[PDB]
Write a protein that binds this ligand. Structure first.
Ligand SMILES: Nc1ncnc2c1ncn2[C@@H]1O[C@H](COP(=O)(O)OP(=O)(O)O)[C@@H](O)[C@H]1O
Ligand SMILES: Nc1ncnc2c1ncn2[C@@H]1O[C@H](COP(=O)(O)OP(=O)(O)O)[C@@H](O)[C@H]1O
Ligand SMILES: [Ca+2]
Ligand SMILES: [Ca+2]
Lengths: 174, 393, 167, 280, 272, 137, 341
């Protein structure tokens, strides 16, 4: 079946019912610092092309909720990188996209409100939003090094081809 | 007899025909007939390749869903199978025809009526497809001990079935149909191409997809790992397909990629292309076998035989056996923990006579002295009636 | 002709008189229910057989009983080709008797086709429509046989010409 | 399809595939195929001695000796030349094709192999056609038992050649349907006055002819004229005449099939009427 | 409490009752068989009361011959004013299961892909709803071959619909022609004739007028009538030598009570 | 399995058992000879062999009656039938059905005409009584 | 006034005392009881016990008990206890299908005609607490199709397939006593054959005694209607119809009969005591395609109100699954040419 995260740890913290997983990033946010060789963002990107075809997905750990969020976001990125005419430009719009206020668990627009726990209060709200933005910025940054061929001004058709597919038939823009 | 019997295996998308004794069918033609829609207008028709894109004619598929939709059309189809392709004097040859799973006694009489009343054949035997497939597998190097107890996995062009058989007799109430077959895989590959490759002639979209499916596809062991191999060393995985444009006569090339393994993958993850079916084929097989009598359960798991063009994908059998073993092993494990069932031997059989298993099996059977004994004759027909062709000895 | 309608009219009237049936549990076998006109194990339950004939060849035999009626028709067959077309057509229908619930699998001796209409049939189908069907059937098989005869001849001419003109 | 084809499709497709691959340089695949043709004909395609660079095509006819008595070997030699070799045991004629030495126009020899059966029959006709053309009369008639219980008689006369078929209608009702077809042949000149004249007798051998008398035996006579037997028409005439018997039986059967569509449609109409008698 | 353990099903209930309050499949294991019975007065098989005796009790009789056909076996137990006669008693190696199994074979020959193990319960239900005993096989075969009145449709669990016609009477015929299912011996009727004949010569007529049926396998429509016709036939040939005029003196009464399906239970229930 | 070949029902004491001359030739021929058609019909419909066991005597009556029916001229049938009483029409209908059992010289063409008239006068019930008769012509 | 309870046959029916409920057999093993609510019918009960098709149903008015008989050879007396009807098996001792049943007017016994060529007279015994029965056998030679009690609850008319209408004495001294003499005869010991019709053609589908019992009428398959007058030495008047066989008949006055059958419409017959002659009174139901209210054979008819002496309303049910209520007064209103008696 679908690919699940193996990063869940007996000491992994939570923000809502999502896993606040560590990430190797320079962007600001509540994400713990990641020492290990790979993080939830790498995992998400490594499973993307495969997971995106699935329509059903069993939520096993709170880590899966984070993995799912990122998977949905990668799609958002592809929708944008698709029209970029150079790697640098794609990095520009990847920052912009990371900046936009996408809906969060509990709000109208968020595609999986029945699965994700809504922030219990204003602090949790701000932290969660902050963790999501940090995840978006880091994800979008790393995706650019994958989507563009050594010959920039050319987003790989091998990534662009997935632009029309939706993980679990869901969408962060829908 | 001096002349070999005629063997006809009419399939949803392809009809295999030839004479008994031969290892391969003499003709494999599309199961279609082209008609115009008094006098001899009934004879103005074509079948097979010649019937696919006939300008002034309309192509029909009398069996594209498993059963005969039009007996008039089927009857005519046979006229040409006999007098145009096989070139057999029907009165001098016994005929062996095959039937779809759970064919009714009524339909058998309709077929006998055509063969005896229209063509006056001297002998007719309507064979059950699954039994012939099992017999065909006896040719396999994985099987040197012949047995008619096994689980047949027949995947053709429009239909796929998991048929359990016990000592030559199909366990009809345990059969399961799977909404994935050749056409589904082709359509899917076509979509994957629509999202990536440019230049594919609209008129030749399915055609191109079919070729990719038949010439480049295979079954991989893991999706992420395969997608990775491709992204890591595209040079050794992406292929090229240079087709021919008809209404342009110009050349057109495309890269063939992920579709190679994604196509057959839908057997294992139907949800990829089917919104209403999600059961993996390994799970369907396990399910079928678990519904059968306990005493025949192991013999079934140990003899899972493949049949049909859609089972031709490389490593289909291996992938099916592994995933099925996981399911079985996982269960027996969870039962010994929750609580000592001896290990379950699961074996998927792939053999060379797999593309035309049914026809081959039917060919071997109609070329043995025995065949002429179990075959209902024209005599018994005219005296006892058509009802005789219900039981298939 | 003025010979066909008078025939069908007399047949129709007779069918109407005979198709007055009711459910009748077996008097001979414990808890059985069988078409009395077939088993004939109780003489009093059987009505007088009657025949309506249009001429020396075309005729209908009607046999009534308390719960079933057997209707047998001698079909018009002028020559040999009509004789085999009729035999084939009746055979064709007889093989499909189950879908033709009121057809006998075999005709009564001396007839080309027989119907077996029971109380269950007159219970689940308007008996006057069944009467009509029998008369309709009688008229239509003659028409169909005529058409088949013309079809065989039409195609034979074309088949003979196609071959000859190629020399 | 009204007229029956003359060439065998299995022979042609088997050879074509092999010639295609040999021409492309691929290594030859082994080939072993057994099959038939109308009139008790049996064929065998294979690699003699397992040599895959060699493809043999053989035909077996129970009545080959009769054809041999009428120029068969000489004609087959003219047509096939060096492809004709010693006949494989169990067969009367064998053709051998060397996948390593094929002609420029492969498609051409494929076509001739396809007509092996027709070519085995050809000489008997050319023989008597020539007789007629050379005014040589009195010559003895040829007798070909093309089926276990059917016979063809060819006789040359001053201004015409007659081909008489003695066919059997196993199915009793098939005799009736046949008569309807033969009657149309009889009256054929009403559609083509230059066409061959066709005579037909039932249960009684014609005049030319111990001809099997019987209720299921039919005698068809074709009177071929110079315009049909001269060097120009000859081949076409032979292609048609040698397929006549199977042409007649083929149409008798297709005729019954068509009648079946009629019955299916009528029976279906009857069932709609009956179901309309249901209250609901 | 009245508990009647059969070769296949269990009929338990109360006294003065009517019909078992519970009828369930008899599937040390019997200690378990009972923990369930008793968990949310007794009968005994032929050669704690005697089933054949009880059968008669519920009929208000003491003498007579009991024909009990159930799931696993079929017996012919002659009882004499009070208790049975463990010596005359005979057994028939054919009953319910056998008929169900035979019906499966017959449906298989018709062309239906049935399996003896997987579809046993399904076909048993077809048998119970559609099967019956032919009075005159010659007559039944004619109906089957010349008409469609015997054809009934039956919906299998998977939705498919099959047809059952001549096999409706063909399967049960096994009870009269054992050779049909590869069994040596004579049929139930002839078996009944011998039992009574091998008995005395005084109360022999007594037995003949008190033949009572018991068991699920005796529910087949027509069974009683077929038994009678066969006994008149046997008696005629093997006792009257063939005097058709004496046949009238043959008083044959086969008691076939409406609630005979659980005649043993009903009995103990009353005797309780 | 030899004892099953004898039908014991034949000697059953329940086997239901039914309840247990012809016209004047001259009288009829006379009415015929003197053109009194209607009187002829009425005469032939007298003394039906409804009680004899001989098929010949019955066929005798049938021939007599039939002879009269053929004699009539289409346009005279209606009037002659209407002269009959109900028991008369009933009997006539029975003779008409017996007539149908043996087509002679197109005799069925006319019998069908009579049947038409007999039906109009006695209704479908006269046909019912043909089927219901235990004693007939 | 027509009402469709189903498209299949209503095998038989019976009404309670006040005619607020009607019990019908929907051509199967059950009996459905329908109650009138406003101008609608509501199903209120399902009596399910028979393992065969119910062939007869009768409702004893006062004691409010329903008796049914079926092809399963059984008969059940149903008693309403609380809100559900409970069945009590009656051992008929018949080896063939029961075909018809009627409660005697005194409600202390009922008769069941069957295929065993016998009539089962049943009554409740307060000894062993259950129903027992005596058989009337001779000289019945075939299945008894219909039964009808004389007003004295002793004489009983029966129609059978041996083409006969007969009157027997069903006297059961265990629940009643010595019947007063009747014009049919003074000697009425159980089983006594008082009268036998003279005809050997036509199954007798229906029989009926007049309000005072001196007259009995019956309809046969030979499309005739007959009436025997005991005040006239049992002379029988006979009338042959021009239409299809009648299946049911009932007196509506001492000299008027209403019958229905395979023609699907009710008809009228009047008896002229003076001339000892029956006459056709005409079609009562005034108009695929059928001009009749019922679309299939009418097989049962029962007087709803006014008894058989002055019926004002009657009911018919048939194979078409319909139930029609006929108003005698209104029929006369629409058919001015109509004349009863
Ligand atoms: N090598 C191949 N790999 C995958 N699919 C194939 C291959 N060859 C043929 N097919 C597919 O097999 C199917 C036809 O198989 P067949 O057994 O004839 O089915 P059917 O009998 O229903 O017509 C088609 O979908 C065809 O495209
Ligand atoms: N209505 C029926 N007709 C024929 N057979 C029946 C019927 N009902 C049950 N049976 C069969 O009767 C047998 C069960 O009867 P039963 O008396 O309970 O046997 P036992 O007491 O030995 O368990 C089974 O074979 C069952 O299929
Ligand atoms: Ca196939
Ligand atoms: Ca038991």
């Amino acid at each position: 079946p679908a690919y699940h995260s193996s990063l869940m740890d007996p000491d992994t913290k939570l923000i809502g019912n999502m896993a606040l997983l560590p990430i190797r990033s320079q962007f600001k946010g509540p994400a713990p610092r990641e020492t290990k060789d790979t993080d939830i963002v790498d995992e998400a990107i490594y499973y993307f092309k495969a997971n995106v075809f699935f329509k059903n997905y069993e939520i096993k750990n709170e880590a899966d909720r984070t993995l799912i969020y990122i998977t949905l976001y990668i799609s958002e990125c592809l929708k944008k990188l698709q029209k970029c005419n150079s790697k640098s430009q794609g990095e520009k719009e990847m920052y912009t996209l990371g900046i936009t206020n996408f809906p969060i668990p509990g709000e109208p627009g968020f595609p999986l409100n029945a699965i994700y726990a809504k922030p219990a209060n204003k602090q949790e709200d701000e932290v969660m939003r902050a963790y999501l933005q940090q995840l978006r910025q880091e994800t979008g940054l790393r995706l650019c090094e994958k989507v563009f061929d050594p010959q920039n001004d050319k987003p790989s058709k091998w990534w662009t081809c997935f632009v029309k597919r939706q993980f679990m038939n869901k969408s962060l823009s829908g | 007899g001096r002349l070999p019997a005629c063997v006809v295996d009419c399939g949803t998308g392809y009809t295999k025909l030839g004479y008994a004794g031969n290892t391969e069918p003499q003709f494999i033609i599309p199961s279609c007939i082209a008609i115009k829609e008094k006098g001899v207008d009934d004879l103005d028709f074509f079948i097979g390749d010649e019937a696919i894109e006939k300008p002034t004619y309309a192509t029909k598929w009398p069996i594209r869903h498993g059963i005969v939709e039009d007996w008039d059309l089927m009857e005519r189809f046979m006229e040409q199978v006999i007098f145009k392709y096989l070139r057999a004097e029907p009165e001098d040859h016994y005929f062996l025809l095959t039937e779809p799973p759970l064919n009714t006694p009524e339909n058998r009489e309709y077929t006998a009526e055509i063969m005896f009343e229209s063509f006056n054949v001297p002998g007719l035997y309507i064979a059950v497809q699954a039994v012939l497939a099992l017999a065909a597998s006896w040719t396999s190097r994985q099987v040197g001990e012949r047995t008619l107890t096994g689980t047949v996995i027949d995947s053709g062009d429009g239909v796929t079935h998991v048929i359990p058989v016990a000592e030559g007799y199909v366990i009809g109430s345990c059969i399961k149909h799977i909404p994935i077959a050749g056409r589904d895989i082709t359509y899917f590959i076509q979509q994957l191409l629509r999202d990536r490759e440019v230049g594919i002639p609209p008129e030749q979209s399915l055609e191109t997809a079919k070729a990719v499916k038949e010439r480049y596809s295979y079954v991989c062991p893991d999706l992420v790992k395969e997608f990775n191999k491709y992204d890591t060393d595209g040079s050794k995985w992406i292929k090229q397909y240079t087709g021919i444009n008809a209404i342009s006569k110009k050349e057109f090339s495309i890269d063939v990629g992920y579709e190679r393994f994604l196509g057959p993958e839908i057997f294992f993850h139907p949800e990829f292309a089917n919104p209403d079916f999600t059961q993996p084929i390994s799970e369907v097989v396990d399910e079928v076998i678990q519904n059968c009598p306990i005493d025949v359960r192991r013999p079934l798991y140990k003899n899972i035989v493949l049949s049909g063009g859609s089972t031709m994908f490389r490593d289909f059998g291996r992938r099916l056996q592994r995933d099925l073993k996981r399911t079985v092993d996982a269960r027996l494990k969870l039962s010994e923990e929750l609580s000592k069932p001896k290990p379950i031997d699961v074996q998927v059989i792939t053999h060379h006579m797999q593309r035309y298993a049914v026809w081959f099996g039917g060919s071997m059977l109609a070329s043995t002295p025995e065949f002429y004994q179990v075959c209902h004759t024209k005599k018994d027909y005219e005296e006892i009636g058509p009802s005789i062709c219900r039981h298939n000895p | 002709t003025a010979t066909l309608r008078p025939y069908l009219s007399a047949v129709r009237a007779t069918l109407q008189a005979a198709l007055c049936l009711e459910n009748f549990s077996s008097q001979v076998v414990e808890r059985h229910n069988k078409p009395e006109v077939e088993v004939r194990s109780s003489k009093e339950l059987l009505l007088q057989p009657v025949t309506i004939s249009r001429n020396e060849k075309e005729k209908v035999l009607i046999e009534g009983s308390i719960n079933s009626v057997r209707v047998s028709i001698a079909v018009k067959q002028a020559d040999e080709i009509e004789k085999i077309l009729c035999h084939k057509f009746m055979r064709f229908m007889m093989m499909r008797a189950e879908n033709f619930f009121i057809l006998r699998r075999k005709p009564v001796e001396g007839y080309d086709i027989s119907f077996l209409i029971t109380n269950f049939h007159t219970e689940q189908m308007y008996k006057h429509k069944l009467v009509d069907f029998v008369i309709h059937f009688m008229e239509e098989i003659d028409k169909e046989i005529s058409e088949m005869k013309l079809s065989v001849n039409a195609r034979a001419r074309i088949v003979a010409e196609e071959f000859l003109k190629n020399f | 399809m009204i007229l029956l084809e003359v060439n065998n499709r299995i022979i042609e497709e088997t050879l074509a595939l092999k010639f295609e691959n040999a021409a492309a340089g691929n290594k030859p695949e082994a080939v072993e195929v057994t099959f038939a043709d109308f009139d008790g004909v049996l064929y065998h395609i294979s690699n003699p001695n397992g040599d895959k660079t060699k493809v043999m095509v053989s035909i077996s006819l129970k009545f080959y000796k009769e054809l041999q008595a009428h120029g068969a070997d000489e004609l087959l030699k003219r047509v096939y030349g060096s492809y004709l070799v010693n006949p494989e045991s169990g067969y009367n004629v064998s053709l051998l094709y060397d996948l390593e030495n094929l002609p420029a126009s492969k498609d051409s020899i494929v076509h001739q192999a396809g007509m092996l059966k027709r070519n085995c029959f050809a000489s008997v006709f050319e023989k008597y056609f020539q007789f007629q053309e050379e005014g040589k009369e009195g010559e003895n008639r040829a007798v070909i038992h093309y089926r276990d219980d059917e016979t063809m008689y060819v006789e040359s006369k001053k201004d015409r050649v007659t081909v008489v078929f003695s066919t059997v209608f196993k199915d009793d009702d098939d005799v009736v349907i046949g008569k309807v077809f033969m009657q149309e042949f009889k009256e054929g000149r009403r559609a083509s006055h230059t066409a061959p004249q066709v005579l037909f007798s039932h249960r009684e051998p014609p005049l030319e002819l111990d001809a099997a008398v019987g209720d299921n035996i039919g005698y068809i006579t074709f009177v071929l004229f110079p315009r049909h037997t001269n060097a120009s028409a000859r081949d076409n005439t032979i292609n048609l005449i040698h397929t006549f018997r199977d042409y007649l039986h083929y149409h008798i059967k297709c005729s019954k099939a068509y009648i079946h569509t009629r019955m299916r449609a009528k029976t279906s109409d009857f069932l709609k009427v009956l179901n309309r008698a249901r209250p609901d | 409490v009245v508990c009647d353990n059969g070769t296949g099903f269990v009929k338990c209930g109360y006294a003065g009752s009517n019909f078992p309050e519970h009828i369930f499949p008899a599937l040390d294991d019997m200690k378990h068989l009972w923990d369930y019975t008793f968990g949310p007065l007794l009968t005994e098989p032929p050669m704690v009361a005697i089933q054949a005796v009880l059968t008669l009790y519920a009929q208000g009789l003491l003498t007579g011959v009991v024909v009990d056909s159930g799931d696993g076996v079929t017996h012919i137990c002659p009882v004499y004013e009070g208790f049975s006669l463990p010596h005359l008693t005979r057994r028939l190696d054919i009953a319910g299961r056998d008929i169900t199994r035979y019906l499966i074979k017959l449906l298989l020959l018709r062309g239906y892909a049935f399996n003896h193990s997987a579809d046993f319960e399904t076909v048993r239900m077809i048998k119970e709803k559609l099967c019956y005993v032919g009075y005159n096989i010659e007559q039944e075969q004619k109906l089957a071959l010349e008409t469609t009145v015997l054809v009934e449709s039956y919906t299998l669990p998977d939705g498919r619909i099959i047809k059952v016609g001549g096999e409706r009477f063909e399967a049960p015929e096994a009870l009269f022609q054992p050779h049909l299912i590869n069994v040596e011996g004579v049929g139930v009727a002839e078996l009944l004739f011998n039992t009574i004949q091998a008995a005395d010569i005084d109360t022999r007529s007594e037995f003949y007028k008190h033949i009572v049926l018991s068991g699920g396998s005796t529910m087949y429509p027509g069974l009683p009538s077929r038994l009678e016709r066969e006994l008149k036939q046997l008696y005629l040939e093997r006792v009257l030598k063939g005097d058709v005029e004496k046949l009238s003196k043959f008083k044959i009464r086969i008691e076939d009570p409406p609630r005979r399906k659980h005649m043993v239970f009903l009995g103990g229930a009353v005797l309780a | 399995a030899r004892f099953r070949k004898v039908d014991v029902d034949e000697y059953d004491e329940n086997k239901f058992v039914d309840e247990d001359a012809g016209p004047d030739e001259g009288e009829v021929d006379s009415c015929l000879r003197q053109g009194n058609m209607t009187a002829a019909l009425q005469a032939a419909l007298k003394n039906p062999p409804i009680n004899t066991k001989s098929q010949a005597v019955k066929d005798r009556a049938g021939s007599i009656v039939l002879k009269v029916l053929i004699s009539f001229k289409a346009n005279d049938i209606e009037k002659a039938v209407q002269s009959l009483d109900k028991n008369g029409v009933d009997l006539l209908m029975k003779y008409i059905y017996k007539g149908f059992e043996s087509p002679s010289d197109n005799s069925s063409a006319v019998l069908l005409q009579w049947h038409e008239k007999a039906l109009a006068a006695g209704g479908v019930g006269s046909i019912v009584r043909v089927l219901t008769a235990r004693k007939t012509v | 006034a027509y009402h469709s309870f189903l498209v299949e046959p209503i095998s038989c029916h019976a009404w309670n005392k006040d005619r607020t409920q009607i019990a019908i057999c929907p051509n199967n093993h059950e009996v459905h009881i329908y109650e009138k609510s406003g101008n609608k019918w509501v199903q209120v009960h399902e009596l399910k016990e028979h393992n065969g098709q119910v062939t007869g149903v009768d409702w004893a008015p006062d004691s409010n008990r329903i008796v049914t008989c079926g092809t399963d050879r059984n008969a059940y007396v149903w008693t309403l206890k609380g809100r559900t009807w409970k069945p009590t098996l009656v051992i008929l001792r018949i080896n063939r299908a029961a075909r018809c049943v009627r409660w005697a007017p005194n409600e202390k016994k009922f008769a069941v005609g069957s295929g065993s060529r016998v009539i089962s007279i049943c009554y409740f015994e307060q000894e062993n607490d259950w129903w027992v029965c005596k058989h009337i056998k001779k000289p019945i030679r075939s299945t008894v199709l219909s039964l009808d009690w004389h007003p004295n609850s002793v004489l009983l008319a029966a129609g059978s397939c041996d083409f006969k209408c007969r009157i027997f004495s069903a006297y059961i001294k265990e629940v009643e006593e010595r019947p007063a003499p009747t014009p049919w005869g003074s000697k009425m010991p159980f089983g006594e054959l008082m009268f036998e019709s003279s005809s050997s053609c036509g199954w007798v589908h229906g029989v009926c005694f007049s309000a005072n019992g001196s007259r009995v009428a019956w309809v046969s398959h030979d499309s005739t209607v007959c009436l025997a007058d005991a005040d006239k030495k049992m002379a029988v008047a006979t009338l042959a119809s021009e239409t299809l066989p009648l299946l049911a008949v009932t007196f509506i006055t001492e000299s008027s009969l209403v019958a229905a059958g395979h023609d699907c419409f009710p008809v009228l017959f009047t008896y002229d005591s003076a001339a000892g002659k029956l006459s056709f009174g005409g079609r009562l139901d005034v108009p695929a395609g059928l001009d009749s209210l019922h679309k299939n054979s009418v097989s049962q008819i029962s007087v709803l109100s006014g008894g058989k002496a002055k019926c004002s309303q009657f009911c018919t049910t048939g194979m078409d699954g319909g139930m029609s209520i006929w108003d005698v007064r209104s029929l006369e209103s629409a058919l001015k040419d109509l004349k009863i008696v």
